[PDB]
Design a protein around this motif. Structure first.
Motif, PDB file in Angstrom:
ATOM      1  N   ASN A 179       4.179  10.891   9.634  1.00 24.24           N
ATOM      2  CA  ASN A 179       2.804  10.939  10.101  1.00 24.24           C
ATOM      3  C   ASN A 179       1.958  11.721   9.091  1.00 24.24           C
ATOM      4  O   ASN A 179       2.422  12.698   8.490  1.00 24.24           O
ATOM      5  CB  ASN A 179       2.694  11.529  11.508  1.00 24.24           C
ATOM      6  N   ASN A 180       0.719  11.252   8.917  1.00 23.07           N
ATOM      7  CA  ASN A 180      -0.287  11.858   8.060  1.00 23.07           C
ATOM      8  C   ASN A 180      -0.869  13.081   8.777  1.00 23.07           C
ATOM      9  O   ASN A 180      -0.549  13.335   9.941  1.00 23.07           O
ATOM     10  CB  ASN A 180      -1.393  10.851   7.730  1.00 23.07           C
ATOM     11  N   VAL A 181      -1.749  13.806   8.080  1.00 23.80           N
ATOM     12  CA  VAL A 181      -2.349  15.043   8.586  1.00 23.80           C
ATOM     13  C   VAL A 181      -3.200  14.757   9.831  1.00 23.80           C
ATOM     14  O   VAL A 181      -3.650  13.634  10.062  1.00 23.80           O
ATOM     15  CB  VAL A 181      -3.178  15.761   7.503  1.00 23.80           C
ATOM     16  N   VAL A 208      -4.045  12.462  14.545  1.00 22.27           N
ATOM     17  CA  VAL A 208      -3.371  12.121  13.306  1.00 22.27           C
ATOM     18  C   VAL A 208      -4.129  10.945  12.673  1.00 22.27           C
ATOM     19  O   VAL A 208      -4.495  10.003  13.367  1.00 22.27           O
ATOM     20  CB  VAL A 208      -1.887  11.816  13.585  1.00 22.27           C
ATOM     21  N   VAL A 209      -4.380  11.017  11.363  1.00 25.02           N
ATOM     22  CA  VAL A 209      -5.290  10.064  10.698  1.00 25.02           C
ATOM     23  C   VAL A 209      -4.564   8.754  10.360  1.00 25.02           C
ATOM     24  O   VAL A 209      -5.223   7.777  10.031  1.00 25.02           O
ATOM     25  CB  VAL A 209      -5.963  10.665   9.446  1.00 25.02           C
ATOM     26  N   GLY A 210      -3.226   8.746  10.424  1.00 26.13           N
ATOM     27  CA  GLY A 210      -2.419   7.536  10.212  1.00 26.13           C
ATOM     28  C   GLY A 210      -0.957   7.876   9.961  1.00 26.13           C
ATOM     29  O   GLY A 210      -0.555   9.032  10.090  1.00 26.13           O
ATOM     30  N   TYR A 211      -0.163   6.854   9.628  1.00 24.07           N
ATOM     31  CA  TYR A 211       1.261   7.013   9.306  1.00 24.07           C
ATOM     32  C   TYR A 211       1.502   6.582   7.855  1.00 24.07           C
ATOM     33  O   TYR A 211       1.012   5.548   7.425  1.00 24.07           O
ATOM     34  CB  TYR A 211       2.128   6.217  10.281  1.00 24.07           C
ATOM     35  N   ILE A 212       2.232   7.418   7.105  1.00 27.57           N
ATOM     36  CA  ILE A 212       2.586   7.156   5.706  1.00 27.57           C
ATOM     37  C   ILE A 212       4.045   6.692   5.655  1.00 27.57           C
ATOM     38  O   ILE A 212       4.945   7.514   5.684  1.00 27.57           O
ATOM     39  CB  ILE A 212       2.365   8.394   4.809  1.00 27.57           C
ATOM     40  N   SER A 213       4.244   5.372   5.570  1.00 29.25           N
ATOM     41  CA  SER A 213       5.564   4.764   5.419  1.00 29.25           C
ATOM     42  C   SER A 213       6.090   4.951   3.990  1.00 29.25           C
ATOM     43  O   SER A 213       7.282   5.244   3.805  1.00 29.25           O
ATOM     44  CB  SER A 213       5.532   3.295   5.777  1.00 29.25           C
ATOM     45  N   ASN A 214       5.200   4.768   3.000  1.00 25.56           N
ATOM     46  CA  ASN A 214       5.585   4.523   1.603  1.00 25.56           C
ATOM     47  C   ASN A 214       5.614   5.836   0.799  1.00 25.56           C
ATOM     48  O   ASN A 214       4.963   5.964  -0.249  1.00 25.56           O
ATOM     49  CB  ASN A 214       4.694   3.462   0.941  1.00 25.56           C
TER      50      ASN A 214
END
Ligand SMILES: *[C@@H]1O[C@H](CO)[C@@H](O)[C@H](O)[C@H]1NC(C)=O
Ligand SMILES: *[C@@H]1O[C@H](CO)[C@@H](O)[C@H](O)[C@H]1NC(C)=O
Ligand SMILES: *[C@@H]1O[C@H](CO)[C@@H](O)[C@H](O)[C@H]1NC(C)=O
Length: 494
Positions: A337-339, A347-353
Protein backbone atom coordinates in the motif's frame (compact mmCIF):
# COMPACT_ATOMS: atom_id res chain seq x y z
CA UNK A 1 7.61 -5.61 28.95
CA UNK A 2 9.10 -3.97 25.78
CA UNK A 3 8.41 -0.31 24.87
CA UNK A 4 6.18 0.26 21.84
CA UNK A 5 9.00 2.23 20.17
CA UNK A 6 11.66 -0.44 20.86
CA UNK A 7 13.26 -0.33 17.37
CA UNK A 8 15.48 2.71 18.15
CA UNK A 9 16.22 1.43 21.70
CA UNK A 10 18.66 -1.00 19.93
CA UNK A 11 21.69 -0.24 17.78
CA UNK A 12 22.09 -2.12 14.49
CA UNK A 13 25.08 -4.07 15.85
CA UNK A 14 23.10 -5.01 19.00
CA UNK A 15 20.46 -6.64 16.73
CA UNK A 16 23.24 -8.71 15.05
CA UNK A 17 24.78 -9.54 18.47
CA UNK A 18 21.45 -10.93 19.78
CA UNK A 19 18.72 -11.33 17.10
CA UNK A 20 16.53 -13.38 19.50
CA UNK A 21 16.19 -10.58 22.07
CA UNK A 22 15.17 -8.15 19.31
CA UNK A 23 12.79 -10.70 17.72
CA UNK A 24 11.19 -11.25 21.16
CA UNK A 25 10.20 -7.55 21.21
CA UNK A 26 9.07 -7.73 17.55
CA UNK A 27 6.74 -10.71 18.21
CA UNK A 28 5.19 -9.04 21.30
CA UNK A 29 4.05 -5.93 19.41
CA UNK A 30 3.21 -7.78 16.15
CA UNK A 31 0.92 -9.89 18.38
CA UNK A 32 -1.13 -6.76 19.23
CA UNK A 33 -2.33 -6.79 15.59
CA UNK A 34 -4.19 -9.99 16.51
CA UNK A 35 -7.36 -8.38 17.93
CA UNK A 36 -11.05 -8.18 16.97
CA UNK A 37 -11.89 -5.30 14.56
CA UNK A 38 -8.13 -4.86 13.85
CA UNK A 39 -6.95 -8.00 11.98
CA UNK A 40 -9.91 -10.41 12.31
CA UNK A 41 -13.57 -10.83 13.22
CA UNK A 42 -13.80 -12.88 16.45
CA UNK A 43 -17.50 -13.58 15.69
CA UNK A 44 -16.82 -15.70 12.58
CA UNK A 45 -13.03 -16.27 13.02
CA UNK A 46 -12.29 -14.64 9.62
CA UNK A 47 -9.37 -12.34 8.76
CA UNK A 48 -9.71 -8.72 7.70
CA UNK A 49 -7.07 -7.50 5.22
CA UNK A 50 -6.13 -5.02 7.93
CA UNK A 51 -7.04 -1.58 9.24
CA UNK A 52 -6.14 2.09 8.93
CA UNK A 53 -4.71 3.76 12.02
CA UNK A 54 -5.10 7.46 12.87
CA UNK A 55 -2.40 9.67 11.35
CA UNK A 56 -1.74 11.41 14.71
CA UNK A 57 -2.64 8.83 17.40
CA UNK A 58 -1.68 5.58 15.58
CA UNK A 59 -4.88 3.92 16.93
CA UNK A 60 -7.15 1.69 14.80
CA UNK A 61 -9.75 3.77 12.90
CA UNK A 62 -11.11 2.33 9.62
CA UNK A 63 -10.85 -1.45 9.06
CA UNK A 64 -10.65 -3.09 5.65
CA UNK A 65 -13.85 -5.25 5.85
CA UNK A 66 -12.62 -7.59 3.10
CA UNK A 67 -9.96 -10.32 2.94
CA UNK A 68 -8.88 -13.33 0.85
CA UNK A 69 -7.44 -16.86 1.14
CA UNK A 70 -3.90 -15.34 0.95
CA UNK A 71 -4.39 -13.48 4.27
CA UNK A 72 -6.21 -16.52 5.69
CA UNK A 73 -3.00 -18.50 4.92
CA UNK A 74 -0.86 -16.13 7.08
CA UNK A 75 -3.35 -16.42 9.98
CA UNK A 76 -3.61 -20.21 9.58
CA UNK A 77 0.21 -20.64 9.37
CA UNK A 78 0.57 -18.71 12.64
CA UNK A 79 -2.11 -20.89 14.29
CA UNK A 80 -0.26 -24.02 13.05
CA UNK A 81 2.81 -22.90 15.07
CA UNK A 82 0.64 -21.79 18.01
CA UNK A 83 -1.23 -25.13 18.32
CA UNK A 84 2.09 -27.07 18.02
CA UNK A 85 3.21 -25.19 21.18
CA UNK A 86 5.76 -22.81 19.58
CA UNK A 87 6.98 -20.37 22.24
CA UNK A 88 7.48 -17.65 19.57
CA UNK A 89 3.91 -18.09 18.25
CA UNK A 90 2.79 -17.90 21.92
CA UNK A 91 4.77 -14.63 22.34
CA UNK A 92 2.59 -13.34 19.47
CA UNK A 93 -0.83 -14.87 20.38
CA UNK A 94 -0.75 -15.00 24.19
CA UNK A 95 2.39 -13.35 25.68
CA UNK A 96 1.01 -12.97 29.24
CA UNK A 97 -0.13 -16.63 29.27
CA UNK A 98 1.81 -18.70 26.67
CA UNK A 99 0.17 -22.03 27.67
CA UNK A 100 -3.23 -20.69 26.37
CA UNK A 101 -1.90 -20.04 22.79
CA UNK A 102 -2.81 -23.56 21.51
CA UNK A 103 -6.41 -23.22 22.81
CA UNK A 104 -6.81 -19.75 21.28
CA UNK A 105 -5.64 -21.06 17.87
CA UNK A 106 -7.94 -24.10 18.23
CA UNK A 107 -10.98 -21.97 19.18
CA UNK A 108 -10.55 -19.48 16.29
CA UNK A 109 -9.90 -22.27 13.74
CA UNK A 110 -13.05 -24.05 14.96
CA UNK A 111 -15.10 -20.84 14.51
CA UNK A 112 -13.34 -20.18 11.16
CA UNK A 113 -14.22 -23.65 9.79
CA UNK A 114 -17.92 -23.18 10.69
CA UNK A 115 -17.80 -19.92 8.66
CA UNK A 116 -16.04 -21.65 5.70
CA UNK A 117 -18.76 -24.35 5.71
CA UNK A 118 -21.68 -21.85 5.83
CA UNK A 119 -20.05 -20.08 2.86
CA UNK A 120 -19.77 -23.38 0.94
CA UNK A 121 -23.47 -24.16 1.58
CA UNK A 122 -24.60 -20.70 0.39
CA UNK A 123 -22.07 -20.45 -2.50
CA UNK A 124 -21.43 -24.09 -3.57
CA UNK A 125 -20.22 -22.95 -7.05
CA UNK A 126 -16.83 -21.97 -5.53
CA UNK A 127 -16.22 -25.72 -4.98
CA UNK A 128 -14.87 -25.17 -1.44
CA UNK A 129 -12.45 -22.40 -2.55
CA UNK A 130 -12.62 -18.77 -1.35
CA UNK A 131 -12.90 -15.60 -3.48
CA UNK A 132 -12.09 -12.18 -2.04
CA UNK A 133 -14.78 -11.92 0.65
CA UNK A 134 -16.45 -9.45 3.02
CA UNK A 135 -15.87 -10.71 6.60
CA UNK A 136 -17.47 -7.83 8.61
CA UNK A 137 -20.76 -9.78 9.07
CA UNK A 138 -21.22 -13.24 10.61
CA UNK A 139 -21.71 -14.93 7.21
CA UNK A 140 -19.13 -14.46 4.41
CA UNK A 141 -20.15 -12.92 1.11
CA UNK A 142 -17.92 -12.42 -1.97
CA UNK A 143 -16.92 -8.79 -2.44
CA UNK A 144 -18.98 -7.34 -5.29
CA UNK A 145 -16.00 -7.45 -7.67
CA UNK A 146 -15.39 -11.16 -6.88
CA UNK A 147 -18.90 -12.54 -7.36
CA UNK A 148 -18.49 -15.60 -9.62
CA UNK A 149 -14.66 -15.22 -9.64
CA UNK A 150 -12.12 -17.34 -7.75
CA UNK A 151 -8.29 -16.93 -7.64
CA UNK A 152 -6.03 -20.01 -7.79
CA UNK A 153 -2.96 -18.29 -6.29
CA UNK A 154 -4.59 -17.24 -2.99
CA UNK A 155 -6.28 -20.60 -2.48
CA UNK A 156 -2.99 -22.48 -3.14
CA UNK A 157 -1.49 -20.56 -0.20
CA UNK A 158 -4.46 -21.32 2.09
CA UNK A 159 -4.57 -25.05 1.19
CA UNK A 160 -0.92 -25.76 2.15
CA UNK A 161 -1.37 -23.62 5.30
CA UNK A 162 -4.39 -25.78 6.34
CA UNK A 163 -2.30 -28.89 5.40
CA UNK A 164 0.35 -27.68 7.91
CA UNK A 165 -2.20 -26.79 10.61
CA UNK A 166 -3.73 -30.30 10.35
CA UNK A 167 -0.30 -31.87 10.92
CA UNK A 168 0.45 -29.46 13.79
CA UNK A 169 -2.89 -30.22 15.52
CA UNK A 170 -2.37 -33.99 15.13
CA UNK A 171 1.25 -33.74 16.44
CA UNK A 172 -0.17 -32.62 19.84
CA UNK A 173 -2.00 -35.97 20.42
CA UNK A 174 -4.73 -33.78 22.03
CA UNK A 175 -8.01 -35.50 21.06
CA UNK A 176 -9.87 -32.15 20.90
CA UNK A 177 -7.20 -30.74 18.52
CA UNK A 178 -7.14 -34.00 16.47
CA UNK A 179 -10.96 -33.87 16.07
CA UNK A 180 -10.60 -30.24 14.87
CA UNK A 181 -7.84 -31.35 12.44
CA UNK A 182 -10.12 -34.08 10.98
CA UNK A 183 -12.94 -31.55 10.30
CA UNK A 184 -10.38 -29.32 8.52
CA UNK A 185 -9.06 -32.40 6.63
CA UNK A 186 -12.65 -32.89 5.32
CA UNK A 187 -12.75 -29.24 4.14
CA UNK A 188 -9.30 -29.51 2.53
CA UNK A 189 -10.07 -32.90 0.91
CA UNK A 190 -13.23 -31.52 -0.74
CA UNK A 191 -11.08 -29.02 -2.74
CA UNK A 192 -9.15 -32.01 -4.18
CA UNK A 193 -12.40 -33.24 -5.81
CA UNK A 194 -13.17 -29.85 -7.48
CA UNK A 195 -9.70 -28.30 -8.19
CA UNK A 196 -9.13 -29.66 -11.73
CA UNK A 197 -12.74 -29.09 -12.89
CA UNK A 198 -12.58 -25.46 -11.67
CA UNK A 199 -8.96 -24.45 -12.46
CA UNK A 200 -7.37 -26.85 -15.01
CA UNK A 201 -8.07 -25.78 -18.62
CA UNK A 202 -5.77 -28.44 -20.16
CA UNK A 203 -2.34 -28.61 -21.87
CA UNK A 204 -0.69 -27.46 -18.60
CA UNK A 205 -2.76 -24.24 -18.44
CA UNK A 206 -4.15 -23.36 -14.98
CA UNK A 207 -6.55 -20.39 -14.57
CA UNK A 208 -5.15 -17.47 -12.54
CA UNK A 209 -8.82 -16.53 -12.04
CA UNK A 210 -11.75 -18.85 -12.87
CA UNK A 211 -15.07 -17.29 -13.94
CA UNK A 212 -18.04 -19.21 -12.51
CA UNK A 213 -21.36 -19.23 -14.40
CA UNK A 214 -23.27 -18.87 -11.13
CA UNK A 215 -21.78 -19.27 -7.62
CA UNK A 216 -25.26 -20.26 -6.28
CA UNK A 217 -25.25 -23.44 -8.46
CA UNK A 218 -23.39 -26.60 -7.26
CA UNK A 219 -20.11 -27.45 -9.01
CA UNK A 220 -21.72 -30.19 -11.16
CA UNK A 221 -25.14 -28.58 -11.68
CA UNK A 222 -26.14 -29.19 -15.36
CA UNK A 223 -25.89 -25.42 -16.11
CA UNK A 224 -22.68 -24.69 -14.14
CA UNK A 225 -19.59 -23.79 -16.19
CA UNK A 226 -16.03 -22.72 -15.36
CA UNK A 227 -13.60 -20.83 -17.63
CA UNK A 228 -10.28 -19.02 -17.15
CA UNK A 229 -10.52 -15.23 -17.05
CA UNK A 230 -8.63 -14.09 -20.17
CA UNK A 231 -5.31 -15.82 -20.89
CA UNK A 232 -3.72 -15.29 -17.44
CA UNK A 233 -2.43 -18.66 -16.18
CA UNK A 234 -0.50 -19.81 -13.11
CA UNK A 235 2.64 -20.54 -15.15
CA UNK A 236 5.48 -18.92 -13.15
CA UNK A 237 7.71 -19.79 -10.14
CA UNK A 238 6.07 -17.26 -7.73
CA UNK A 239 3.17 -17.76 -5.28
CA UNK A 240 0.93 -19.51 -7.86
CA UNK A 241 3.28 -22.52 -7.85
CA UNK A 242 1.67 -23.71 -4.59
CA UNK A 243 -1.60 -24.28 -6.50
CA UNK A 244 0.27 -26.18 -9.28
CA UNK A 245 1.37 -28.70 -6.61
CA UNK A 246 -2.22 -28.94 -5.31
CA UNK A 247 -3.41 -30.00 -8.80
CA UNK A 248 -0.46 -32.38 -9.29
CA UNK A 249 -0.78 -34.32 -6.03
CA UNK A 250 -4.55 -34.20 -5.42
CA UNK A 251 -6.36 -33.10 -8.60
CA UNK A 252 -6.56 -36.50 -10.36
CA UNK A 253 -4.51 -35.30 -13.38
CA UNK A 254 -2.90 -37.84 -15.77
CA UNK A 255 0.91 -38.25 -15.82
CA UNK A 256 0.85 -36.47 -19.24
CA UNK A 257 -1.11 -33.56 -17.68
CA UNK A 258 1.41 -33.33 -14.78
CA UNK A 259 4.27 -33.22 -17.35
CA UNK A 260 2.25 -30.53 -19.21
CA UNK A 261 2.01 -28.38 -16.01
CA UNK A 262 5.79 -28.19 -15.64
CA UNK A 263 6.41 -27.89 -19.40
CA UNK A 264 4.10 -24.88 -19.68
CA UNK A 265 5.78 -23.38 -16.56
CA UNK A 266 9.36 -23.93 -17.84
CA UNK A 267 9.77 -20.71 -19.94
CA UNK A 268 8.98 -18.53 -16.85
CA UNK A 269 11.82 -20.13 -14.82
CA UNK A 270 14.86 -18.08 -15.92
CA UNK A 271 18.44 -17.51 -14.67
CA UNK A 272 19.68 -13.88 -14.66
CA UNK A 273 22.72 -12.16 -13.11
CA UNK A 274 22.37 -9.11 -10.85
CA UNK A 275 25.36 -6.77 -11.33
CA UNK A 276 25.34 -3.09 -10.27
CA UNK A 277 28.45 -1.13 -9.27
CA UNK A 278 30.88 -3.44 -7.46
CA UNK A 279 28.07 -5.84 -6.43
CA UNK A 280 27.97 -9.07 -8.46
CA UNK A 281 27.49 -10.76 -10.70
CA UNK A 282 24.99 -12.71 -8.53
CA UNK A 283 22.93 -15.40 -10.34
CA UNK A 284 19.25 -15.27 -9.29
CA UNK A 285 15.86 -16.59 -10.34
CA UNK A 286 14.38 -13.80 -12.50
CA UNK A 287 11.46 -12.22 -10.63
CA UNK A 288 8.18 -10.73 -11.78
CA UNK A 289 9.20 -7.42 -10.12
CA UNK A 290 11.60 -9.19 -7.72
CA UNK A 291 9.18 -8.04 -5.03
CA UNK A 292 9.86 -10.04 -1.83
CA UNK A 293 6.20 -11.25 -1.90
CA UNK A 294 7.04 -13.47 -4.93
CA UNK A 295 9.15 -15.81 -2.71
CA UNK A 296 6.14 -16.71 -0.47
CA UNK A 297 6.00 -20.41 -1.62
CA UNK A 298 9.19 -21.30 0.32
CA UNK A 299 7.33 -20.70 3.61
CA UNK A 300 4.66 -23.32 2.77
CA UNK A 301 6.57 -26.22 1.12
CA UNK A 302 10.13 -27.56 1.72
CA UNK A 303 11.80 -25.94 -1.31
CA UNK A 304 14.94 -25.34 0.79
CA UNK A 305 15.41 -29.11 1.33
CA UNK A 306 16.82 -28.97 -2.25
CA UNK A 307 20.38 -27.54 -2.19
CA UNK A 308 20.37 -25.94 -5.68
CA UNK A 309 17.09 -24.19 -4.76
CA UNK A 310 18.39 -23.04 -1.36
CA UNK A 311 21.56 -21.67 -3.08
CA UNK A 312 19.52 -19.82 -5.79
CA UNK A 313 17.18 -18.28 -3.16
CA UNK A 314 20.16 -17.45 -0.87
CA UNK A 315 21.61 -15.56 -3.87
CA UNK A 316 18.30 -13.62 -4.10
CA UNK A 317 19.01 -12.15 -0.63
CA UNK A 318 22.61 -11.28 -1.54
CA UNK A 319 21.15 -9.30 -4.43
CA UNK A 320 18.21 -7.88 -2.41
CA UNK A 321 20.23 -6.53 0.56
CA UNK A 322 23.26 -5.31 -1.44
CA UNK A 323 21.03 -3.75 -4.14
CA UNK A 324 19.60 -1.40 -1.52
CA UNK A 325 23.13 -0.54 -0.25
CA UNK A 326 24.50 0.20 -3.76
CA UNK A 327 21.36 2.23 -4.74
CA UNK A 328 21.42 3.95 -1.29
CA UNK A 329 17.94 2.86 -0.15
CA UNK A 330 17.31 2.53 3.65
CA UNK A 331 15.03 -0.51 3.16
CA UNK A 332 13.92 -3.05 0.56
CA UNK A 333 11.03 -3.39 -1.88
CA UNK A 334 7.80 -5.35 -2.15
CA UNK A 335 4.21 -4.89 -3.37
CA UNK A 336 2.64 -2.63 -0.76
CA UNK A 337 0.00 0.00 0.00
CA UNK A 338 1.05 3.57 -0.83
CA UNK A 339 1.22 6.42 1.72
CA UNK A 340 -1.78 7.85 3.58
CA UNK A 341 -2.94 11.36 2.65
CA UNK A 342 -2.98 12.94 6.16
CA UNK A 343 -5.81 15.34 5.13
CA UNK A 344 -8.23 12.50 4.18
CA UNK A 345 -6.84 9.54 6.19
CA UNK A 346 -7.07 7.50 2.96
CA UNK A 347 -4.32 5.41 1.37
CA UNK A 348 -3.62 7.03 -2.04
CA UNK A 349 -3.27 3.64 -3.86
CA UNK A 350 -1.47 0.27 -4.02
CA UNK A 351 2.08 -0.15 -5.41
CA UNK A 352 2.35 -3.63 -7.00
CA UNK A 353 5.49 -2.93 -9.08
CA UNK A 354 8.13 -2.43 -6.34
CA UNK A 355 11.24 -4.64 -6.53
CA UNK A 356 14.54 -4.81 -8.45
CA UNK A 357 14.11 -3.91 -12.16
CA UNK A 358 17.43 -5.34 -13.53
CA UNK A 359 16.50 -8.90 -12.38
CA UNK A 360 12.76 -8.62 -13.13
CA UNK A 361 10.40 -9.50 -15.99
CA UNK A 362 8.57 -6.18 -15.39
CA UNK A 363 11.20 -3.41 -15.48
CA UNK A 364 8.76 -0.46 -15.12
CA UNK A 365 8.79 0.00 -11.33
CA UNK A 366 7.91 2.49 -8.59
CA UNK A 367 10.74 2.55 -5.99
CA UNK A 368 9.80 5.52 -3.75
CA UNK A 369 8.10 3.31 -1.06
CA UNK A 370 9.84 0.68 1.16
CA UNK A 371 8.22 -1.77 3.60
CA UNK A 372 9.43 -3.84 6.61
CA UNK A 373 7.93 -7.11 5.23
CA UNK A 374 10.45 -6.94 2.30
CA UNK A 375 12.87 -8.60 4.82
CA UNK A 376 10.85 -11.84 5.22
CA UNK A 377 12.94 -13.84 2.63
CA UNK A 378 16.19 -12.50 4.17
CA UNK A 379 14.97 -13.60 7.63
CA UNK A 380 14.74 -17.27 6.43
CA UNK A 381 18.51 -17.25 5.66
CA UNK A 382 19.80 -14.83 8.34
CA UNK A 383 17.48 -13.56 11.13
CA UNK A 384 20.07 -10.95 12.25
CA UNK A 385 20.49 -9.31 8.85
CA UNK A 386 16.71 -9.59 8.22
CA UNK A 387 15.92 -7.86 11.52
CA UNK A 388 18.67 -5.23 10.97
CA UNK A 389 16.89 -4.22 7.75
CA UNK A 390 13.51 -4.46 9.53
CA UNK A 391 14.86 -2.18 12.32
CA UNK A 392 16.26 0.36 9.84
CA UNK A 393 12.79 0.80 8.29
CA UNK A 394 10.90 0.60 11.65
CA UNK A 395 12.99 3.51 13.07
CA UNK A 396 11.54 5.73 10.32
CA UNK A 397 9.04 8.21 11.72
CA UNK A 398 5.60 6.58 12.39
CA UNK A 399 6.90 3.12 11.42
CA UNK A 400 6.02 1.52 14.77
CA UNK A 401 2.57 1.57 16.36
CA UNK A 402 0.72 -0.17 19.23
CA UNK A 403 0.03 -3.05 16.79
CA UNK A 404 3.75 -3.44 15.78
CA UNK A 405 5.23 -2.32 12.43
CA UNK A 406 3.52 0.16 10.10
CA UNK A 407 2.66 -0.83 6.48
CA UNK A 408 5.25 1.25 4.58
CA UNK A 409 7.27 4.48 4.35
CA UNK A 410 8.58 6.62 1.53
CA UNK A 411 12.34 6.05 1.34
CA UNK A 412 12.74 9.89 1.50
CA UNK A 413 10.66 9.87 4.74
CA UNK A 414 8.09 12.47 3.55
CA UNK A 415 5.13 10.03 3.81
CA UNK A 416 3.90 6.84 5.51
CA UNK A 417 1.10 4.33 4.91
CA UNK A 418 -0.82 4.66 8.22
CA UNK A 419 -2.11 1.14 7.85
CA UNK A 420 -1.79 -2.45 9.10
CA UNK A 421 -2.21 -5.55 6.88
CA UNK A 422 -1.43 -9.26 7.31
CA UNK A 423 0.70 -9.05 4.15
CA UNK A 424 3.00 -6.26 5.51
CA UNK A 425 3.30 -7.65 9.07
CA UNK A 426 2.51 -11.36 9.58
CA UNK A 427 4.47 -12.45 6.50
CA UNK A 428 7.54 -11.41 8.52
CA UNK A 429 6.20 -13.12 11.65
CA UNK A 430 5.75 -16.38 9.71
CA UNK A 431 9.35 -16.07 8.36
CA UNK A 432 10.61 -15.56 11.96
CA UNK A 433 8.77 -18.82 12.90
CA UNK A 434 10.60 -20.57 10.01
CA UNK A 435 7.53 -20.99 7.75
CA UNK A 436 5.43 -24.18 7.91
CA UNK A 437 7.56 -26.20 5.42
CA UNK A 438 8.70 -28.48 8.30
CA UNK A 439 5.09 -29.39 9.22
CA UNK A 440 4.18 -29.77 5.52
CA UNK A 441 7.15 -32.04 4.71
CA UNK A 442 6.21 -34.31 7.66
CA UNK A 443 2.68 -34.79 6.27
CA UNK A 444 4.06 -35.05 2.68
CA UNK A 445 6.44 -37.84 3.79
CA UNK A 446 3.60 -39.65 5.63
CA UNK A 447 1.42 -39.43 2.44
CA UNK A 448 4.38 -40.45 0.22
CA UNK A 449 4.39 -37.30 -1.98
CA UNK A 450 7.62 -35.81 -0.49
CA UNK A 451 9.94 -37.81 -2.80
CA UNK A 452 7.91 -36.74 -5.86
CA UNK A 453 8.11 -33.06 -4.79
CA UNK A 454 11.92 -33.27 -4.36
CA UNK A 455 12.53 -35.20 -7.59
CA UNK A 456 10.35 -32.89 -9.68
CA UNK A 457 11.44 -29.52 -8.24
CA UNK A 458 15.16 -30.41 -8.11
CA UNK A 459 14.94 -31.46 -11.80
CA UNK A 460 13.22 -28.23 -12.87
CA UNK A 461 15.61 -25.93 -10.93
CA UNK A 462 18.83 -27.89 -11.74
CA UNK A 463 17.92 -27.73 -15.48
CA UNK A 464 17.87 -23.88 -15.41
CA UNK A 465 20.45 -22.94 -12.71
CA UNK A 466 23.75 -24.58 -13.79
CA UNK A 467 26.64 -22.13 -13.21
CA UNK A 468 25.89 -19.95 -10.15
CA UNK A 469 27.91 -16.75 -9.69
CA UNK A 470 28.13 -14.49 -6.62
CA UNK A 471 27.81 -17.19 -3.94
CA UNK A 472 30.81 -15.55 -2.20
CA UNK A 473 29.02 -12.16 -1.99
CA UNK A 474 28.03 -11.57 1.69
CA UNK A 475 24.61 -10.20 2.66
CA UNK A 476 24.83 -6.41 3.01
CA UNK A 477 23.71 -4.41 6.07
CA UNK A 478 21.79 -1.07 5.85
CA UNK A 479 24.14 1.91 5.20
CA UNK A 480 21.43 4.65 4.90
CA UNK A 481 18.67 5.70 7.36
CA UNK A 482 15.10 6.82 6.56
CA UNK A 483 15.37 10.67 6.41
CA UNK A 484 13.56 12.60 9.18
CA UNK A 485 11.69 15.38 7.34
CA UNK A 486 9.31 16.50 10.13
CA UNK A 487 6.89 13.54 10.38
CA UNK A 488 5.94 12.92 14.05
CA UNK A 489 5.71 9.46 15.66
CA UNK A 490 2.20 8.30 16.62
CA UNK A 491 1.28 9.73 20.05
CA UNK A 492 0.55 6.22 21.43
CA UNK A 493 3.93 4.86 20.21
CA UNK A 494 6.87 7.22 20.71
C1 LIG B 1 -19.74 -28.10 0.09
O1 LIG B 1 -21.05 -28.18 -0.49
C2 LIG B 1 -21.15 -29.29 -1.39
C3 LIG B 1 -22.43 -29.20 -2.23
O2 LIG B 1 -23.55 -28.79 -1.45
C4 LIG B 1 -21.05 -30.57 -0.57
O3 LIG B 1 -21.22 -31.74 -1.38
C5 LIG B 1 -19.69 -30.61 0.13
O4 LIG B 1 -19.63 -31.71 1.03
C6 LIG B 1 -19.46 -29.33 0.93
N1 LIG B 1 -18.09 -29.29 1.42
C7 LIG B 1 -17.74 -29.63 2.66
C8 LIG B 1 -16.27 -29.56 2.95
O5 LIG B 1 -18.54 -29.98 3.50
C1 LIG C 1 -27.90 -17.56 -10.00
O1 LIG C 1 -28.52 -18.74 -9.46
C2 LIG C 1 -29.47 -18.43 -8.43
C3 LIG C 1 -29.89 -19.68 -7.68
O2 LIG C 1 -30.87 -20.37 -8.45
C4 LIG C 1 -30.63 -17.71 -9.10
O3 LIG C 1 -31.66 -17.47 -8.15
C5 LIG C 1 -30.11 -16.40 -9.67
O4 LIG C 1 -31.17 -15.67 -10.30
C6 LIG C 1 -28.99 -16.70 -10.66
N1 LIG C 1 -28.46 -15.43 -11.15
C7 LIG C 1 -28.54 -15.03 -12.43
C8 LIG C 1 -28.06 -13.64 -12.70
O5 LIG C 1 -28.99 -15.73 -13.32
C1 LIG D 1 2.01 6.79 -4.55
O1 LIG D 1 1.86 8.13 -4.05
C2 LIG D 1 2.65 9.11 -4.75
C3 LIG D 1 2.45 10.47 -4.09
O2 LIG D 1 2.79 10.30 -2.71
C4 LIG D 1 2.29 9.16 -6.23
O3 LIG D 1 3.15 10.08 -6.94
C5 LIG D 1 2.40 7.75 -6.81
O4 LIG D 1 1.95 7.73 -8.16
C6 LIG D 1 1.55 6.78 -6.00
N1 LIG D 1 1.59 5.45 -6.60
C7 LIG D 1 0.56 4.60 -6.64
C8 LIG D 1 0.81 3.34 -7.44
O5 LIG D 1 -0.51 4.82 -6.10
Amino acid sequence: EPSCRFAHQYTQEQVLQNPSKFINDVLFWEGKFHQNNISYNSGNGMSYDGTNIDWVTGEGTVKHPFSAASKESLQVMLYAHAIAGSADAARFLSPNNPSAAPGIAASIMDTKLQTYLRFNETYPGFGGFLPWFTSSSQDLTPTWDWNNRVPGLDNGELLWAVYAFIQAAENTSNKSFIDLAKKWQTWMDYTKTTAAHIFYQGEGKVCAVTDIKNQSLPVYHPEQTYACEGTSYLNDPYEGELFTWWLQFFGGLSDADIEALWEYKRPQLVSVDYHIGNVGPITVQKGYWFSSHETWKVLEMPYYDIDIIRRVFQNAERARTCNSVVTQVPGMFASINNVTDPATGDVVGYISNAGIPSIANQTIQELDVITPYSVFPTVLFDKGVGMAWWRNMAIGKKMQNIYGSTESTRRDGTGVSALLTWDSKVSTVNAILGGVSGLVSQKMKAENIYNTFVERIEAEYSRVFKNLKGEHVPFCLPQETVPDTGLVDFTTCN
